[PDB]
């Protein structure tokens, strides 16, 4: 129906917005990250706290570092079993499947 020169004209424009919606999704995640880290890692309110509540906050932070660190390890391990099986699927699906200038300069030259 339409020229073959058109069908490549439209593909070049698909991989141009699918490359624009790919990096717009990026800085829609950096904003999402900063927002989500202001809820989880709330900035500290250290002015006014006496020694008691200073030393109580420092202790509750000492116990949260160890809690957050394995909340991360348990998602760090899920993506480690997903990498291993991504390579399992990506493989088991593979087990089922002249020169221009060198020639124009020979016959011509300039």
């Amino acid at each position: 129906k339409i020229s073959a020169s058109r069908k490549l004209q439209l593909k070049t424009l698909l991989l141009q917005i699918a490359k624009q919606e790919l990096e717009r999704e990026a800085e829609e995640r950096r904003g999402e990250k900063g927002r989500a880290l202001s809820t989880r890692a709330q900035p500290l309110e250290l002015a006014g706290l006496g020694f008691a509540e200073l030393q109580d906050l420092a202790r509750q932070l000492h116990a949260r570092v160890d809690k957050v660190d394995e909340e991360r390890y348990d998602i760090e391990a899920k993506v480690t079993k997903n990498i291993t099986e991504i390579a399992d699927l990506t493989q088991k699906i593979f087990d089922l499947r002249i020169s221009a200038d060198a020639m124009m300069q020979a016959l011509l030259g300039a």
Partner: protein
């Protein structure tokens, strides 16, 4: 509690008294900022791992399709 729970509860309290209990209000303000930046860094690395997990399932699901469709 019992004793291996007692041992765990006691040693973890001993971990705080070793790093926090010899500090004054200024020396321990700095400790709180230091401990918070560690949390910001591990929560960021978790968020980055959380988003990769949402993506690996899509990749796994499409690989699940291609094996399902190519036999």
């Amino acid at each position: 509690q019992t004793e291996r729970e007692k041992k765990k509860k006691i040693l973890a309290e001993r971990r705080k008294v070793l790093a926090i209990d010899h500090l004054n209000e200024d020396q321990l303000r700095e400790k709180a900022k230091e401990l918070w930046q560690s949390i910001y860094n591990l929560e960021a690395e978790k968020f980055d791992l959380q988003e990769k997990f949402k993506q690996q399932k899509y990749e796994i699901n499409v690989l699940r399709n291609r094996i399902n469709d190519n036999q």
